[PDB]
Amino acid sequence: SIYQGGNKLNEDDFRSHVYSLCQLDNVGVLLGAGASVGCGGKTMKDVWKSFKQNYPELLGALIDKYLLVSQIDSDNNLVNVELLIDEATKFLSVAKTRRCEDEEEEFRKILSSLYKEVTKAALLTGEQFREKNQGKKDAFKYHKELISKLISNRQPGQSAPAIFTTNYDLALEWAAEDLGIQLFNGFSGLHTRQFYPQNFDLAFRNVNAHYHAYLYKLHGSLTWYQNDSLTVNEVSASQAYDEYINDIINKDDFYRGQHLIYPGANKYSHTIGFVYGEMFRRFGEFISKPQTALFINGFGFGDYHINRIILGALLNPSFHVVIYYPELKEAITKVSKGGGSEAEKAIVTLKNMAFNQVTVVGGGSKAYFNSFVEHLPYPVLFP
Amino acid sequence: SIYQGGNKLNEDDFRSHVYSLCQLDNVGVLLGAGASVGCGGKTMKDVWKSFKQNYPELLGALIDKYLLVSQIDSDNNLVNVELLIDEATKFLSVAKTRRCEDEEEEFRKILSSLYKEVTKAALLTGEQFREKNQGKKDAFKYHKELISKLISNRQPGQSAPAIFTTNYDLALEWAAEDLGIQLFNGFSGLHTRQFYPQNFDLAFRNVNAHYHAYLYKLHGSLTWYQNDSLTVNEVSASQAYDEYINDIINKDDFYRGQHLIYPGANKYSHTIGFVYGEMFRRFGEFISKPQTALFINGFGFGDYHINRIILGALLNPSFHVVIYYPELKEAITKVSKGGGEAEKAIVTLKNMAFNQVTVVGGGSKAYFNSFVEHLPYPVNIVDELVEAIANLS
Amino acid sequence: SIYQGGNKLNEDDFRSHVYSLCQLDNVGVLLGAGASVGCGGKTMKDVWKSFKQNYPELLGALIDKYLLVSQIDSDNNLVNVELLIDEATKFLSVAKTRRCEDEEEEFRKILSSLYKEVTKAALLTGEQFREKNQGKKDAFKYHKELISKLISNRQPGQSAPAIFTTNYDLALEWAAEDLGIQLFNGFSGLHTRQFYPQNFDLAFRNVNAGHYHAYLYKLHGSLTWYQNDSLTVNEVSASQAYDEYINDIINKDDFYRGQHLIYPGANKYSHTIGFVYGEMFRRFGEFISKPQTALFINGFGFGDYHINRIILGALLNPSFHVVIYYPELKEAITKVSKGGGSEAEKAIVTLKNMAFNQVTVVGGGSKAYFNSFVEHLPYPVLFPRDNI
Ligand SMILES: NC(=O)c1ccc[n+]([C@@H]2O[C@@H](COP(=O)([O-])OP(=O)(O)OC[C@H]3O[C@@H](n4cnc5c(N)ncnc54)[C@H](O)[C@H]3O)[C@H](O)[C@H]2O)c1
Ligand SMILES: NC(=O)c1ccc[n+]([C@@H]2O[C@@H](COP(=O)([O-])OP(=O)(O)OC[C@H]3O[C@@H](n4cnc5c(N)ncnc54)[C@H](O)[C@H]3O)[C@H](O)[C@H]2O)c1
Ligand SMILES: NC(=O)c1ccc[n+]([C@@H]2O[C@H](COP(=O)([O-])OP(=O)(O)OC[C@@H]3O[C@@H](n4cnc5c(N)ncnc54)[C@H](O)[C@@H]3O)[C@@H](O)[C@@H]2O)c1
DSSP: OOOBTTBOOOHHHHHHHHHHHHTSSOOEEEEOTHHHHHTTOOOHHHHHHHHHHHOHHHHHHIIIIIOSSOHHHHHTTOOOSHHHHHHHHHHHHHHHHHTOHHHHHHHHHHHHHHHHHHHHHHOSSSGGGGOSOOTTOGGGHHHHHHHHHHHTSOOTTOOOOEEEEOOSSOOHHHHHHHHTOOOBOSBOOSSSOOBOGGGGGOOOOOOOOOOOOEEEETTOOSSOOOOSSSOOOOOOTTTHHHHTHHHHHHSOOOOSSSSOOOOSSOOSSSOOOHHHHHHHHHHHHHTSSSSOOOOEESOOSOOHHHHHHHHHSTTSSSOOEEEOOTTHHHHHHHHHTTOOOHHHHHHHHHHHOSOSSEEEOOOSGGGOHHHHHHHSOOOOSOO | OOOSSSOOOOHHHHHHHHHHHTTSSEEOOOOOSGGGGGGTOOOHHHHHHHHHHHOGGGHHHHHHTTOSSOHHHHHTTOSOHHHHHHHHHHHHHHHHHHTOHHHHHHHHHHHHHHHHHHHHTTOOSGGGTTSSOOTTSGGGHHHHHHHHTTTTTOOSSSOOOEEEEOSSSSHHHHHHHHTTOOEESSEEOSSSBEEOGGGGGEEEEOSOOOOOEEEEETTOOSSOBOSSSSSOBBOOHHHHHHHTHHHHHSOSSOOOOTTSOOSSOOTTSHHHHHHHHHHHHHHHHGGGSSSEEOOOOSOOOOOHHHHHHHHHTTTOSOOOEEEEOTTHHHHHHHHHTTOOOHHHHHHHHHTSOOTTEEEEOOSSSOSHHHHHHHSOOOOOTTHHHHHHHHHOO | OOOBTTBOOOHHHHHHHHHHHHHSSOOOOEEOSTTTTTTSOOOHHHHHHHHHTTOHHHHHHIIIIIOOSOHHHHHHTOOOSHHHHHHHHHHHHHHHHHTOSHHHHHHHHHHHHHHHHHHHTSOSSOGGGSOSOOOOSGGGHHHHHHHHHHHHTOOTTOOOOEEEEOSSSOHHHHHHHTTTOOOBOSOOOSSOOOOOGGGGGOEEEEOOOOOOOOEEEESSOBTTBOOOTTSOOOBOOHHHHHHHTSOTTTSOOSOOOSOSBOOOOSOSSTTOOOSHHHHHHHHHHHHHTSSSOOEEEESOOSOOSSHHHHHHHHTTSSSOOEEEOOSTTHHHHHHHHTTOOOTTHHHHHHHHHSSOTTOOOOOOSTTSSHHHHHHHSOOOOSSSSOOO
16 A cells, blocks of 8 residues: 555654654645645635536537537546636737737636636635634634644744645634734734735744744735735735725626736736745745755645745755655556656656655545644653 | 046046946846847847848738737837747647637748748858857957956955856857856756756855856757757757757748747746746846845836836845947937937936946947956967977878 | 685674665775666677677688687687787787788778677667657666665765766666766766866755765766867767767768777777876775775676776775675686686685685675665665664
8 A cells, every 4th residue: 555665664653753853943834725625615626616507608608619628528527727717818818919809808707707706715704704703713723723733843942834825715814813823924014014024034032031933825815916006915804805805806897917816827927926936936945954844735736836846956865745645546547557647647756756755655544634633743841 | 438417537437346346245247139249140120020021921911810010010120029929829729729720821831931030040150050169260259358357357265257148049158168167057967958946056165175157048048948858958059950950940831839948938838937937036036145236238128027027126225237328319319309218218317316327328439349348357379289280291 | 505704694794784884984886787688688699699690701711811719719609809809909000010901901891890889789779769868767767776875875974975887878877867866977068078187076055045976987988979189078968879970880881980989808008098097097096095985896797907906906905895796606616626717707716715804705696686786775864763
C-alpha cells in the first residue's frame, strides 16, 4: 500500500519526526481549497454543476454552434472550469477588438455571470455572512484549534508559523476573532486598510518582565476591489454586504475586474494585480533557509507556479514535504495505461523523486482531515 | 553637454557624480535598442512597413474584417505589431474552433510571410551561421573597448557587475562569451539548458578559505523554444539552425502550431507566461536592495500596463533618469507653434526645476562614440600570429 | 569461498565501514564498462566478432603477409587490439619517415577504419540518440540513485565526492540532466567550454534567506570532443554530435584526422601533445595525498601503467584505500598458481596480497555487481532513525 524505496516506515516514528522537525527554525503549512470543504464550502464540481444547470442555453449554444467541448466530456463529468474562463476572456478580447456587437453582448454575460457565481460561492454561510459573532461559530473548530496548536509548539526565540489558504472567503480572521489571536497580514488600522512592508515586522512580547501567526493571502482577497486609481481597501464581511457587492450583483451592469479575483488560467490580461507578485516572491524567499519544515493537505494538483517552486529547491537537505493524495492508486493505474493529464503526471513525478526528503502515505480512511489534526501531539516539557 | 536656461555647464561634475553613484552595492547599466542602428542593426517596423507596402492586396482584409488596427494607426506606427501577431496566435484557435478555414489560411500565410521577412535579414552570417562564437570579427572591435572599461573599474571586495542586454539576438552575447567569462542567461547546462528559478537568488564562492555576473535578456530569445518538453530548452546556434530555424529561413510558407516559445507569445498558454512573469518580477524587484541606482533609457512610456507598473514601482527613493533627445530643437519649435501628448509631457518635464532628472539635447553629441567617450577611463596582438603561421610552410 | 585470515565479518562491520568511509573528509568512486552489459547495450566482443568476419582483406593480410597476429589467438578470441593500435601508429611513423607510398595508404586506411569502429560502440540506443531531455529512460535510474546518494552525504564541512568515468558514452551526464544535477567534470560553459583550473571551487550558496555537484574526472577525454585548429574544445549535444561530426560512418569513409580525443591504446606518450592531461594526473595525486581518503574501483579492467603505478606508489598512504569488485577472484588466483596469469592480473593479486590492512578484498559473486555498488551507499541520516 505504501512504497518508500522498497522499505517500510511506521507513523509512530513519524510522530517524533514531526515533533522534532517543528522545533526547527522554519515552520509552516501549504494547504489549498480543500480546507474550505471541511467548513461546509462548495467544491469546484458543485460550482460547475450550478453554473451548467442555471444556464442551459449557454451550454447548448457552446455545444452546438462552436463545439469548444464534446458531449462526451459532459457525460463523464470531465469538464474543467478555468479553461472555460480563459477561453471566454480571449474570445471577449477578440470581439472587443473586432467590434462585433452581438458577440460582445453575449460574451459580457459569461464573464460577469461566472464571476458573480464565483463570489457567491466564496461565502460559506449565505445570509448569515452579514451576521456578527463570527468567531463564536462552532464550525471553525479546525482553524480555532490549528492556529493555537501551530503557535503553541514553541519556546522563546523561535519563528512564526505560516498558514497557507487559497480561497476568497475571509475565513481566517474569524477563528482569530474567537480566540483573540492576531493573524497578521501586513495591514494596520480598521477604519482604513492599506499595505506596508514594514508592518510585517511586528511581533507581540511580554512587557512586565503571546499566540499569533502570519498570513500569506496567495489567492487574493474578497474585498480588495481596486478602483484602477492606485487604491486598496477592505470592508468587513457585514459592511461590504451592501456597499458594492450588492450593487455589482444586482445592478446588472457591464462587468470588469470590479473587485480583483483570479480563478482562471488567464492571469495578466489585466496587469494590476500586485498581490500575486508580492505573495509569490515572499513564498520563494521562504525556502531559502536550512533546517526547514512544511506540510501539505487540502490542496489539489493544478498549480503550475507553486508546484514549480516546490521542486525548484527541494534539492536542499532540510526542506521537506509530507504530501498526501488519497487518489494516488487511481492516478497510478490511469498513468500505467499511457499517462494522464497535468495533475496525474505531476503527482507521479512528485512521488517518484528518488529522495528520502519526501514520503507519501495513503490508505483511504486513514488519511482523513481529522487524522491530520490528531497527528500533531501535545508538547511535552520533559521529552 | 547639459543645458538649463541657456548657461554652459562642465562635464567634469557629471562625470564625478556618475562615478560616485557607480560605487553603490547595487548598480547596473542598460543598452538601448537604437545604439546598434549604426552597426547594421534593423528594426521590425521597417520590415513591417516594407512588407505591407509591397503586398497591399491583403491590407483590406487586415483592418476592415479584423479591426486589430486602423489605417491611420497602422501608418502612424502607434501599434504593437508584436501584439498584433500575438493576437493572431489566438485568432488561429478561434478560427479552428469555428472551422473558419479561409481566415485560418489568411492568418497562416501572413504569419509565415512576416516570419520569413524578419528572419532573412537577421542572419548576418551567411551560410556560416551555425559556427559558434562568430563574434571575433572586427566589425564590433570598437565595442570591445567599452567592455574594457568595466574591468578596471571593479575593485576587490565590491559588488559584482550586472549585465543587461536589450536585443533578442546573440551577436553581442557571442562576443561577450568570447571574451572568456562565465555568464548565466537564466539557465544552467550544456546539452539541455533549462529554466530554474532557484538560480535567481544564488551566487558562487570558494568553499575553502569568486566573481560571478548575471546576464538579463530583456527581449526573450531566438533560441528559447519548446520541443514538447513542457519546459524551456536553450542550446547553441547549430542545432537551432537544424531543428526549427531552418524552415523559418528557407520554407516560404510553413508553420505547424503553438510549439515554439517566442517572442512574448502564447501567454494564454500556461507554458510560456510563467518564465516571463518570473523575469518581469526579477526585473521590477531587483532594485529592492539598499543603496541602489537605476538608469532607464530609450523607453517611450507608450504602454498603459508598463506605464502603470513604472508608476507603482516608485517605491525606491534613489531613482535617477537621463534622457537623450536628438530632436530637442524640433520639439521646442513645435511647442512654439502651439501644437504637438508625449512631446508636451516631455517638454513640461524638461521645463521644471528638478535637478535629479538629466536631459541631453546636443543632437550630434549623443552618438554612440560620444557616449562611450563620456564614460570615465583610467589616467598588434594578433598581427604576428598571421606572419608566424605563414612562415611555417 | 570467503577467507580473510581464516575468519569472517558480520554485516554490522560492513555497515560501519560504509558509514565511516562516507563520513570521512573525502569519498571515492571509479566507473568502467565492466558491468555495462545488463542495460540492453552492446559490448566490444560483438564489435570484434563483426570486424574479423566483415573485412577479409586485412585479416588475410595479417594472417599471411604482416604476421602481426597469430591464428590461434584470433580463433580463441582472446587477442588484444590496443597493442595492435600502438603497432599501427609505430608502423605509420616509420613508413612516413622512410618515404614509402603503398604502406602509407594501407596504414592510413587501417587507422581511420579502426577509429570509425572505436567511435561506433558508444550509442546503446540507436537512431533516437539525437534528442533532448535525454535523462528520461529506464537505463539511468541507478545512475540517478548513485548521484543523489553521493551528493546528499555531504553534511556541513564535507565536500562533494570525486567520480571517475572510464568509458565512451555519457550516461552519467544524462542522469545529471534529469535531476538538476550538473556533475562538474572539468568544463563549465554554454557556447565554449574552456578548462579553467579555478573552476573546481565553484558552487551555489543560499545568499539571501540547490547545493548538488561532484567531480566527474574524465581521464579518457570524451566522445563529445571535436578538436579544432584553435586548440579549444567547443562542445555539442548528442544530436548536434550525430549531425555534424559522426555522420562520416555512412556518407564518407576514412577521412578522420584528429577531431575527437579518445584512446584505447596502452601508450601514453605517442599522444604526448596534451598537457592538461598531466593536470588531471596532478589532481589525482592531490587526491592520493590526504588522510581519511578512499578510492573505490568498479569497472577498471587492469589496463593502466601511469595511474596504476601511482596507485602502487600511493597505496603507502596510511588511509588511502583501493578496492575492486571482481567476481573472477578464485579463478585468476588458481590460474596464476597453475602457471598462467595475465599481463596485469599479477598486480591485482599482489595488491590483494599486500600486507596492508588498509586494503581488503571482499567478494561474494552475485552481490558484487554494479547494482549492489549503487545500492551500497546510504543517504545521510540526521533527523531519521538514530541510536540510543
Ligand atoms: N490575486 C493573487 O494574489 C493571486 C496570486 C497567485 C495566484 N492566485 C490564484 O491563486 C491560485 C489558487 O489555486 P486555484 O484556485 O487555481 O485551485 P486550487 O489549487 O486551490 O484547488 C484545486 C482543487 O483541487 C480539489 N482537490 C483536492 N484534492 C483533490 C484530489 N485528490 N483530486 C482531485 N481534486 C482534488 C480541491 O477541492 C481544490 O483545491 C489560482 O490558480 C489562481 O487564480 C491569486
Ligand atoms: N524577459 C523578456 O524576454 C521581455 C522583457 C520585457 C519585454 N519583453 C517583450 O515585451 C513583451 C510584450 O511587449 P511590450 O508591449 O511590453 O513591448 P513593446 O516595445 O512592443 O511596446 C511598448 C510600447 O511602446 C510604444 N512606442 C511608442 N513609441 C515607440 C517607439 N519609438 N519604439 C517602440 N515603441 C514605441 C508602442 O506603441 C508600444 O509597443 C513580450 O514578451 C515581448 O515582446 C520581453
Ligand atoms: N594516450 C592518451 O593521452 C590517453 C588518453 C586516455 C586514456 N589513456 C590511458 O589509456 C589507457 C587505456 O584507457 P582506459 O583505461 O580508459 O581503458 P578501459 O578502462 O576502457 O579498459 C576496460 C576495457 O575492458 C577490457 N575488455 C573489454 N573486453 C574484454 C574481453 N572480451 N576480455 C578481456 N578484457 C576485455 C579491456 O581490458 C579494456 O581495457 C589507460 O591506462 C588510461 O585510461 C591515455
